Design an enzyme around this catalytic site. Structure first.
Site, PDB file in Angstrom:
ATOM      1  N   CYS A   1      17.277  16.723  -0.995  1.00 24.00           N
ATOM      2  CA  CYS A   1      16.347  17.328  -0.833  1.00 24.00           C
ATOM      3  C   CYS A   1      16.362  17.230   1.138  1.00 24.00           C
ATOM      4  O   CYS A   1      15.197  17.575   1.866  1.00 24.00           O
ATOM      5  CB  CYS A   1      15.087  16.621  -1.150  1.00 24.00           C
ATOM      6  SG  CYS A   1      14.638  15.451  -0.758  1.00 24.00           S
TER       7      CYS A   1
ATOM      8  N   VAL B   1      15.906  20.740   2.435  1.00 24.74           N
ATOM      9  CA  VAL B   1      15.048  21.467   4.090  1.00 24.74           C
ATOM     10  C   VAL B   1      16.013  21.113   5.004  1.00 24.74           C
ATOM     11  O   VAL B   1      15.218  22.244   6.086  1.00 24.74           O
ATOM     12  CB  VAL B   1      14.271  19.696   3.632  1.00 24.74           C
ATOM     13  CG1 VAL B   1      13.701  20.729   5.561  1.00 24.74           C
ATOM     14  CG2 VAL B   1      13.151  20.154   2.974  1.00 24.74           C
TER      15      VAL B   1
HETATM   16  S1  CLF Z   1      16.370   9.333   0.153  1.00 26.21           S
HETATM   17 FE1  CLF Z   1      14.525   8.062  -0.422  1.00 26.21          FE
HETATM   18  S2  CLF Z   1      14.969   8.030  -2.754  1.00 26.21           S
HETATM   19 FE2  CLF Z   1      16.571  10.463  -1.845  1.00 26.21          FE
HETATM   20  S3  CLF Z   1      14.465  12.076  -2.033  1.00 26.21           S
HETATM   21 FE3  CLF Z   1      14.667  11.122   0.309  1.00 26.21          FE
HETATM   22  S4  CLF Z   1      13.095   9.574  -0.572  1.00 26.21           S
HETATM   23 FE4  CLF Z   1      13.569  10.153  -2.332  1.00 26.21          FE
HETATM   24 FE5  CLF Z   1      13.989  12.257  -3.833  1.00 26.21          FE
HETATM   25  S5  CLF Z   1      13.980  14.052  -5.280  1.00 26.21           S
HETATM   26 FE6  CLF Z   1      15.618  14.373  -5.800  1.00 26.21          FE
HETATM   27  S6  CLF Z   1      16.183  11.473  -5.826  1.00 26.21           S
HETATM   28 FE7  CLF Z   1      16.359  12.632  -3.053  1.00 26.21          FE
HETATM   29  S7  CLF Z   1      17.211  14.784  -4.365  1.00 26.21           S
HETATM   30 FE8  CLF Z   1      15.227  14.101  -3.263  1.00 26.21          FE
END
Ligand code: CLF
Ligand code: ICS
Ligand code: ICS
Ligand code: CLF
Ligand SMILES: [Fe+3]
Ligand SMILES: [Fe+3]
EC number: 1.18.6.1
Lengths: 477, 522, 522, 385
Positions: free
Chosen positions: B152, B156
């Site tokens: 994500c 973004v």
């Molecule tokens: S480094 Fe940490 S776990 Fe990663 S997103 Fe960022 S806060 Fe979360 Fe989340 S929904 Fe899926 S798992 Fe990511 S691509 Fe985004």
């Protein structure tokens, strides 16, 4: 085995890397020198991972939501952002608690904002306010809300602090905004730091002017114990049999109320230095509360820590400490007599996150086992300063080890047992090496204290000496 | 305290008297816990219809979702190709979570890399991360292919995957001929199955878009089978077995069955099996392409129809009796091969099991959830069995899919009391199974907590969970099961009827109270 | 009373208040029931050690046996041949019971005939019965073979099977060339497996005794496989599949797989598949004969070694890992075919599953029962998994088999707490599981009552039952399962580990009581 | 006699006596005297329901046997039988009687089970009933019923002839021949006692030896299974002067008719109670008919007492013996299932039930609609064939 052999092994493992990656990763591998105090001259840590090398580290959201804030049972923790981060971290950590899930406890539940494209393009602050209202409507017995930011929240310019302020003022609820976006920092360590700062700035000072809590000279708070499989309870029963009163537990089976009561305790017993040293130092500088590190892994460390803790109080606590030690001596002596002849001389390689790579060495040595290699995903240089004296001479130390590096080190050293996370378990199990989960205790435990030591010895023997390890080779091959 | 002869784990060690007293002291002195009467009142309220109305009035809070994010499905799709490393451009925490999720479901190693995008890349982008990561991954893990998805963060920020790969190749970080297919996988759009579709479309486009001049449809006399997001090894195996029995040439594109079931023989295999690049290149030459899970393969279907010119047959997931039958007729029509006597015999044996177990399966009520094609196949099979799927929940389903499922229900007398819920989560299902209690739930391990909640209302209110779907974490080796074809229908039917019989045995085990119905024969 | 929308079967209908009042009045007025305190005291006494000594002092009373009579095994053996009609010379109620037993286990039509010997035959024998029965059976059901066993009445009155068949052929009731193999199957000797052995030896003698002049060992380049008394269709399937994978020519003598799994397609098939008479005639030409269940094929082994001159290998039942390995290596040695990579990969996958589940399987205690070979294979497999088979009961085992099982137990550290009981029944085992409680029981459906008894003592004393063996009446389609080879080992391992996991889930489902250990991930 | 080698459903005399008549007596221990097979195959085969603590005071689903071996066949099993009776007394002290059901070898080896039973019963002051029910006797289970009834008459029925302490009422009835298959006898008893009657005895289903001994004290004997109990009903009429009448609680019409017929044998209070019960249950079975008859109207049934319920549901019985549906045993169930016709077991009620009474009619209608209208029967031919 020798220092020169270990250095040569490190060099040939590094041979596969490109120039920049090899130069960077050379500084994170070392041959242990127990006489060295400043590990900065030997190893380098708390640096960014090399791209595309199968790092084992998590993110800052893992260090804040998954580690510090999640175990708090009466608080509802919102994974602010898309669904993945909350879904993959739901109930994956065995931070044990007592409560009615969904009513007054919410640890194993997954609350999230479930960001869609419209929330990315137009922001989700309105969605966050509406979500807080919905949480209040549907879970009236929650005692607070934390908002753990995922990666997009910081990037899209969301202001969770303003929404938290407004909703907390309106509903008279403790709403804690946490800027723990995954891209922040290099690992879960910055997540720990951000979570500690959030605790300090939003929870810890709630009862600064409150004087209704009857305090005793024996008020202690357990900090950095997240009750993995019940570890915090196994430590607490020992501490209270010693005549102490455990006012707070940070944060396994922890409530927000006892976190707010921590400034009233007389001593802060820090188990995980890495994740809660920030809040321990803050409490020392603000409330004058001393804090001390303690280790309850194995009988030797448990007894040493109990005596060190009892030396901070009157002679009655010391007498009760001696009584507890005498009471529990036959139990762990029987455990040792049963299991040590089965585990004597067996070599162990560990790779856990930030505290256990050095904290569990005493328990392993209590059963005759020798740790030949240790490493951390996200430790700092102070952790390696503490680790170097624990490990034996010419043993291997790895920081932010890669999957390739770990596999090559295991192939060369050939340990009898490996203790690491779920991402290494089946790799090393297909290689024929017994493996133990040193994060979740392989869904067993607790391992802290004397009861924990009994369970730990049983598990180590059951996995290391399991018959399935003599059957990997087909008799016709 | 512990006795070395019988060492207690946390259960039942913490049920000891001293631990009970310690927990009571902690709760009474420091937790400021609500009164137990208040807690029971609030729980009983949460089991009511008014609470259900409040829960279903939700518009911003999601509690216990039944879906994951796109890059997980993209990684699964990448795992199905020969010597292919999944590579997620973005932050490493996502990759750690993906690997842990698949490790717990499959109890197997899961290989995936990230380029570790850090806040210093949160402004400038991840171009340098892409170059260094591609070079490091190719040098260290030596894949024949690197399949790229995104987190994500990168979506973004707006990282240009195509331009970054092109710059990495242009600067000599990776060879120009090295295959690096990519796909944009925004975790805020769709779910994991959407990620699988996006990754597959990226790989197919990479290997086929610029080489359609010499492609002729039906020249290799094979059929392309696209499984989609599939977490049962037995489903890959049953598709391959049924196609091989019919004497039908096939190319299972994205086959991760070998890499997710490597033997434990003293060596670790990062790569095993998988669709070869030659297979993907020759895929446009096939007679046709059959999508096993069309409801989350829309982009792949569009690409296959518009580029390869394969007339993709309108087929449901081959689940249950009728849909497996239709799949076999369509495969026979495309390939020209007759359906062999062995498959006819297997169909007859499935019908025999149906007639054997219909008395116990008739009229049973089910609340089910999962991925769209999986749950529509489950609903169709339950209708074929005479069961009533009262609560159909699909967090990652859409309105047209709901129309399709409603049409399926309308064709059966047993779908009259059935409701389809899209965009709802497991808290909604908890309210549903409290207010409108079914006999059983069908779903992943996340449903176990719902069962616990029901048991708290009473033993007569407990709704048992049948673990069919993804992910299954609290049971071992259920990922080896089959849900597709006659064999999958057999396994599902056996599980359902034996679950009913086990529940009946538990209810009638009370000596001198209910064991008058504790029949030896059932 | 009943509600039309929710109609209750006997459970929970008889739990309604009016039925409870009526039953209470019936009991208190006319049943002269012992006081409930007296019943509770007697039950508690029956759960004690002193009652166990009294139970094990039994010498004339058998309570809840774990065996059947020879003609049932003879009928099962006869069903394994092509178009072969099982025929029991003696009383018809025996045949009715045999057909009902196999009907309830396999949920399939079972064909068996009787000559309906009555009181008159108690004087002058069943010679006329044999003639009329053979004639009528051949005329009506048109079998290629009629395989003759006996009931207890025929054995007691001393009916001569051979003379009766010879007189039936001589008097024109049946053609002299019509194959009518026979076997004396005294129901007071041995058990059903002994009947299987007797029937098979009789058929082999019928087809091969007089035709040994032209037989040459190893002239058809095949291996004879004798399965024995086997009620799992998957076992026949897995033996055939593993032999075909190796490319090993084989003859499965007495294969009932096809006739016990006839598809439902609109017509009833009395006969399906099975060993042909040409296969039995050519059996002496094979390289060797492998007995899958050597501990109840003693007469068959004597005939094969003494007549066919086959050097029958000393093989255990191919159950578990080590014994499947030995079976595969011995088959390779006999046939000269190397073990293929597919079987090696399957073995590695089984080892992978053992490695994955060893933590949950370690140290678990089991009380098991069944036939000798199946029981000993289960004991071997449990010892391979780190489990402890504390109570090993074989009602139809002997001293030599007990010696072999004790030797197997002595070779493993997990056989230290094990005891083998031959000649004991399920009441003995009920006492054993009350006094030395294991974690689980493994056995047929008859054990479900033992579990009930344990649950009456308390939930903490309940020993759950795992249904592996014969007969299984209260579950559906478990006969389709496999217990042989790597596939059977995988199925048994999955069953064991998941039974442990369901038990743990049940024990930790109490909210705020034990649910702290209700882990999502196990 | 049965034609040899034709594949009969028919059972033996042992199945008629032990399986049908004696077995459901819950507080009595039944010994299958002989080899293991007969006891093992008949254990819990029939669903004769009962209330008790199995192994302590009830023993219906248990299997007691002598486990005859070659030595017992050659040298007899009388000493073995006496030792077995001693062991039964030692291990099951709350048993209120022992029956010894002979198997095929017992008669042929010249075993004197009557003398052993008499001696042991005199010694232990216990009622031990020798039943000569060898399987080769007769041509079916009917002679087993007859022998079991004769044993009941000779050894159980008349031991309270002198006893007068029982307080009999003018409305005392005994249910005879109802074996409580799936709770059928309980569903009949609830209606009978809703009529103001008092079912003093109900054997064998959920039956006690005490209430068998109390049967000569009742005012009327309601016989459901005429075939297996006509002998004892006739003997009881001849010796004690108790009238016996047949009844049928299968289907609403039949149970209404039977309730009226039984009430007509008593005074007007019982008839008023009968009318009240009929009116109370009328809406229930009327709603059941309204629901299920449209689903089962115009359907033909074959079978091998129950025609009333089928006709009350709108079915037409076009076959019976001793189509859209066949109702028979387990040995024909799968045979008829493979030809593609829906099948119902009319012996165990397909492990469902009860079927008798107004309560049983709802279950019966639900089961018929379930099996006949199941989608599995329309999925027989592959779409490519
Ligand atoms: S480094 Fe940490 S776990 Fe990663 S997103 Fe960022 S806060 Fe979360 Fe989340 S929904 Fe899926 S798992 Fe990511 S691509 Fe985004
Ligand atoms: S908090 Fe830390 S990685 Fe100190 S993030 Fe991690 S429950 Fe590890 S070595 Mo998982 S610094 Fe705790 C840890 Fe140690 S989740 Fe647990 S086991 S003692
Ligand atoms: S006793 Fe008879 S075969 Fe009258 S032996 Fe049989 S429980 Fe049948 S038609 Mo099973 S003469 Fe009863 C009978 Fe009818 S066992 Fe039951 S159903 S009403
Ligand atoms: S007609 Fe009836 S059931 Fe048959 S024997 Fe005779 S009493 Fe009994 Fe018994 S042990 Fe086996 S099943 Fe027989 S062959 Fe003997
Ligand atoms: Fe594995
Ligand atoms: Fe069948």
């Amino acid at each position: 085995m020798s220092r020169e052999e270990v250095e040569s092994l490190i060099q040939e493992v590094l041979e596969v890397y490109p120039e920049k990656a090899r130069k960077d990763r050379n500084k994170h591998l070392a041959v242990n020198d127990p006489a060295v105090t400043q590990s900065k001259k030997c190893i380098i840590s708390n640096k960014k991972s090399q791209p595309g090398l199968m790092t084992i580290r998590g993110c800052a959201y893992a260090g804040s939501k998954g580690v510090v804030w999640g175990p708090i049972k009466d608080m509802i923790h919102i994974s602010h952002g898309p669904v993945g981060c909350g879904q993959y971290s739901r109930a994956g950590r065995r931070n044990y608690y007592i409560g009615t899930t969904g009513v007054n406890a919410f640890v194993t539940m997954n609350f999230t904002s479930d960001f869609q494209e419209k929330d990315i393009v137009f922001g989700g602050d309105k969605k966050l306010a509406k979500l807080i209202d919905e949480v209040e409507t549907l879970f009236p017995l929650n005692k607070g809300i934390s908002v753990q930011s995922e990666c997009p929240i910081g990037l899209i310019g969301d202001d969770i602090e303003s929404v938290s302020k407004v909703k907390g003022a309106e509903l008279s609820k403790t709403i804690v905004p946490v800027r723990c976006e995954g891209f922040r920092g290099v690992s879960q360590s910055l997540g720990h730091h951000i979570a500690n700062d959030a605790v300090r700035d939003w929870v810890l000072g709630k009862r600064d002017e409150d004087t209704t809590f009857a305090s005793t000279p024996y008020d202690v708070a357990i900090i950095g114990d997240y009750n993995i499989g019940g570890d915090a309870w196994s430590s607490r029963i020992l501490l209270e049999e010693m005549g102490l009163r455990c006012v707070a537990q940070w944060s396994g089976d922890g409530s927000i109320s006892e976190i707010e009561l921590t400034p009233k305790v007389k001593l802060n017993l820090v188990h995980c230095y890495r994740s809660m040293n920030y809040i321990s130092r803050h409490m020392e500088e603000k409330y004058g509360i001393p804090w001390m590190e303690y280790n309850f892994f194995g009988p030797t460390k448990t007894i040493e820590s109990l005596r060190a803790i009892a030396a901070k109080f009157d002679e009655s606590i010391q007498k009760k400490c001696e009584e507890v030690i005498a009471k529990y001596k036959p139990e762990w002596e029987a455990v040792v007599a049963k299991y040590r002849p089965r585990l004597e001389g067996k070599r162990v390689m560990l790779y856990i996150g930030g505290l256990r790579p050095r904290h569990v060495i005493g328990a392993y040595e209590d059963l005759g086992m020798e740790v030949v290699g240790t490493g951390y995903e996200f430790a700092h240089n102070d952790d390696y300063d503490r680790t170097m004296k624990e490990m034996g001479d010419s043993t291997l130390l790895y920081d932010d080890v890669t999957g390739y590096e770990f596999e090559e080190f295991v192939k060369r050293i050939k340990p009898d047992l490996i203790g690491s996370g779920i991402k290494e378990k089946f790799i090393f199990q297909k290689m024929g090496i017994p493996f133990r989960e040193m994060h979740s205790w392989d869904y067993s435990g607790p391992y802290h204290g004397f009861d924990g030591f009994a369970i730990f010895a049983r598990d180590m023997d059951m996995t290391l000496n399991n018959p399935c390890w003599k059957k990997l080779q087909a008799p016709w091959e | 305290s512990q006795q070395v002869d019988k060492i207690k784990a946390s259960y039942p060690l913490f049920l000891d008297q001293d631990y009970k007293d310690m927990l009571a002291k902690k709760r009474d002195g420091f937790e400021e816990k609500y009164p137990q009467d208040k807690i029971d009142e609030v729980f009983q309220w949460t089991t009511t219809k008014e609470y259900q109305e409040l829960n279903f009035q939700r518009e911003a809070l999601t509690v216990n979702p039944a879906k994951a994010c796109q890059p997980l499905g993209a990684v699964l799709c990448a795992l199905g190709f020969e010597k292919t490393m999944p590579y997620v451009h973005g932050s490493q925490g996502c990759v750690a979570y993906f690997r842990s999720y698949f490790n717990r479901h499959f109890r197997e190693p899961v290989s995936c890399v990230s380029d570790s995008m850090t806040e210093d890349a949160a402004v400038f982008g991840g171009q340098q991360n892409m170059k260094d990561g591609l070079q490091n991954c190719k040098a260290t893990y030596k894949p024949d292919m690197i399949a790229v998805s995104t987190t994500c963060m990168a979506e973004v920020i707006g990282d240009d995957l195509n331009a970054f790969i092109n710059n990495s190749k242009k600067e000599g970080f990776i060879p120009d001929e090295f295959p690096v297919p990519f796909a944009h996988t925004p975790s805020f759009v769709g779910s994991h199955v959407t990620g699988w579709d996006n990754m597959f479309e990226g790989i197919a486009r990479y290997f086929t878009l610029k080489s359609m001049d010499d492609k002729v449809v039906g020249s290799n006399k094979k059929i392309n089978i696209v499984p989609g997001f599939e977490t049962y090894l037995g489903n890959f195996r049953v598709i391959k077995r049924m196609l091989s029995e019919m004497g039908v040439g096939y190319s299972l594109l994205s086959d991760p069955e070998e890499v997710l079931d490597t033997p434990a023989d003293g060596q670790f295999r990062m790569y095993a099996g998988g669709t070869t690049q030659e297979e993907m290149k020759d895929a446009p030459n096939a007679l046709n392409t059959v999508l096993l899970q069309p409801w989350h393969l829309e982009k792949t279907k569009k690409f296959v129809e518009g580029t390869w010119k394969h007339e993709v047959p309108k087929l449901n997931i081959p689940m249950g009796l009728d849909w497996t039958d239709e799949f076999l007729m369509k495969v026979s029509e495309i390939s020209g091969q007759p359906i062999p006597a062995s498959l006819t015999k297997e169909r007859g044996r499935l019908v025999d099991m149906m007639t054997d177990s219909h008395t116990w399966l008739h009229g049973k009520r089910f609340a089910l959830w999962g991925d769209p094609d999986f749950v529509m196949g489950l609903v169709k099979f339950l209708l074929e069995l005479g069961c009533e799927p009262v609560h159909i929940l699909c967090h990652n389903g859409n309105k047209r899919w709901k129309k399709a499922v409603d049409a399926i229900l309308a064709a059966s007398p047993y779908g009259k009391n059935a409701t389809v819920y899209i965009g709802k989560d497991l808290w909604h299902l908890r309210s549903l199974v409290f207010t409108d209690k079914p006999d059983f739930m069908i779903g992943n391990s996340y449903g176990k907590f719902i069962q616990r909640d029901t048991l708290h209302k009473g033993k007569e209110f407990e709704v048992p969970l049948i673990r069919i779907g993804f992910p299954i974490f609290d049971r071992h080796h259920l990922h080896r099961s089959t849900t597709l074809g006659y064999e999958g229908a057999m396994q599902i039917l056996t599980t359902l009827v034996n679950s009913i019989l086990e529940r009946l045995d538990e209810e009638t085990r009370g000596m001198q109270a209910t064991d008058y119905n504790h029949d030896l024969v059932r």
